[PDB]
From a paper:
The Domain of Unknown Function 26 (DUF26; Gnk2 or stress-antifungal domain; PF01657)18,19 is an extracellular domain harboring a conserved cysteine motif (C-8X-C-2X-C) in its core. The third class of DUF26 domain-containing proteins is the PLASMODESMATA-LOCALIZED PROTEINS (PDLPs). PDLPs contain two DUF26 domains in their extracellular region and a transmembrane helix, but lack a kinase domain. We defined the structural relationship of tandem DUF26 domains by determining crystal structures of AtPDLP5 (residues 26–241) and AtPDLP8 (21–253) ectodomains to 1.25 and 1.95 Å resolution, respectively.
The DUF26-A and B domains in PDLP5 and 8 closely align, with root mean square deviations (r.m.s.d.s) of 1.6 and 1.2 Å when comparing 89 corresponding Cα atoms, respectively. The DUF26-A and -B domains in PDLP5 and PDLP8 have 24% and 30% of their residues in common, most of which map to the hydrophobic core of the domain (including the six cysteine residues forming intra-molecular disulfide bonds) and to the DUF26-A–DUF26-B interface. Consistently, the ectodomains of PDLP5 and PDLP8 belonging to different phylogenetic clades closely align with an r.m.s.d. of ~1.6 Å when comparing 198 corresponding Cα atoms. These observations suggest that evolutionarily distant DUF26 tandem proteins likely share the conserved three-dimensional structure. Notably, Glu130 and Arg132 implicated in mannose binding in Gnk2 are replaced by Asp131 and Lys133 in the DUF-A of PDLP5, respectively. A similar pocket is found in the DUF-A domain of PDLP8, but not in the DUF-B domains of either PDLP5 or 8. We next explored potential binding sites in the two molecules by analyzing sitewise ω for orthologs of PDLP5 and PDLP8. Low ω values were observed in structural context, indicating conservation of residues buried inside the DUF26 domain, while variable residues (under more relaxed selection) appear on the surface of the structure. The different surface charge properties of related PDLPs from Arabidopsis suggest that different PDLPs and other DUF26-containing proteins sense a diverse set of ligands. Notably, we observed typical lectin-dimers in PDLP5 and PDLP8 crystals, in which two lectin domains dimerized along an extended antiparallel β-sheet.
Residue numbers in the entry: 25 to 74, 78 to 237
Write the structure that this text describes.
């Protein structure tokens, strides 16, 4: 289901208890849970430019192909987990199968960012199967076409999934996924299955009966 751990990262810079930033962070996470109920994505800014007094900027993105109640469950789990693995971080991100949660002290909302956050290539490689690679190419090409939300793609026994985070413009979503696919090709050349997660999007492919 939608709750297994994919990756997490925290800022090296830590905040101290009983500061405005701690308060702002709590308020943010509380808002994320509230917003969960009836939106799959939302953006937030709490507070004022500063550091202990700093503003918080953040967002969450649930898998767009999942129900309301499932998005809330995932986000509640996410708020608990991100606190657990990143106790006193000024910045943190967390990707579960079902949802993504991010906050920082800098205003990253809406800005393109294609930096690599996480990737995994399957240990099993396909060899002597040109057809597999052509089908992968067709799938990845279709994923790259995404402008809003998510795409599921399929060609033969090759399946793919891509998602843009809801703070991106269409043009920026296309560019982000273009970089994802480039990365899938260049880091995981021969893998039967791989995933690449950038700052503002991700893309995965896998073999079905492979
Ligand atoms: C934050 O407060 C400072 C004064 O300390 C002010 O210069 C600035 O305009 C404010 N910005 C926001 C976003 O409230």
């Amino acid at each position: 289901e939608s709750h297994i751990f994919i990756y997490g990262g925290c800022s090296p810079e830590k905040y101290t208890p009983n500061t405005p930033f701690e308060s702002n962070r709590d308020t943010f996470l509380s808002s994320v849970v509230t917003s969960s109920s009836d939106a799959s994505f939302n953006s937030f800014a709490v507070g004022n430019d500063s550091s202990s007094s700093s503003a918080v900027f953040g967002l969450y993105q649930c898998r767009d192909d999942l129900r309301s109640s499932d998005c809330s469950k995932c986000i509640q789990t996410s708020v608990d987990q991100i606190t657990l693995i990143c106790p006193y971080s000024y910045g943190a991100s967390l990707q579960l199968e079902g949802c993504f949660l991010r906050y920082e002290t800098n205003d990253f909302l809406g800005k393109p960012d294609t930096s690599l956050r996480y990737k995994k290539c399957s240990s099993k490689s396909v060899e002597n199967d040109y057809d597999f690679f052509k089908r992968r190419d067709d799938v990845l090409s279709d994923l790259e076409s995404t402008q809003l939300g998510y795409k599921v793609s399929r060609s033969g026994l090759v399946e793919g999934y891509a998602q843009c985070v809801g703070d991106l413009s269409p043009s920026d979503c296309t560019a982000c996924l273009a970089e994802s696919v480039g990365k899938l090709k260049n880091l995981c050349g021969s893998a039967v299955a791989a995933e690449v997660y950038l700052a503002q999007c991700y893309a995965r492919y896998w073999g079905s009966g492979y």
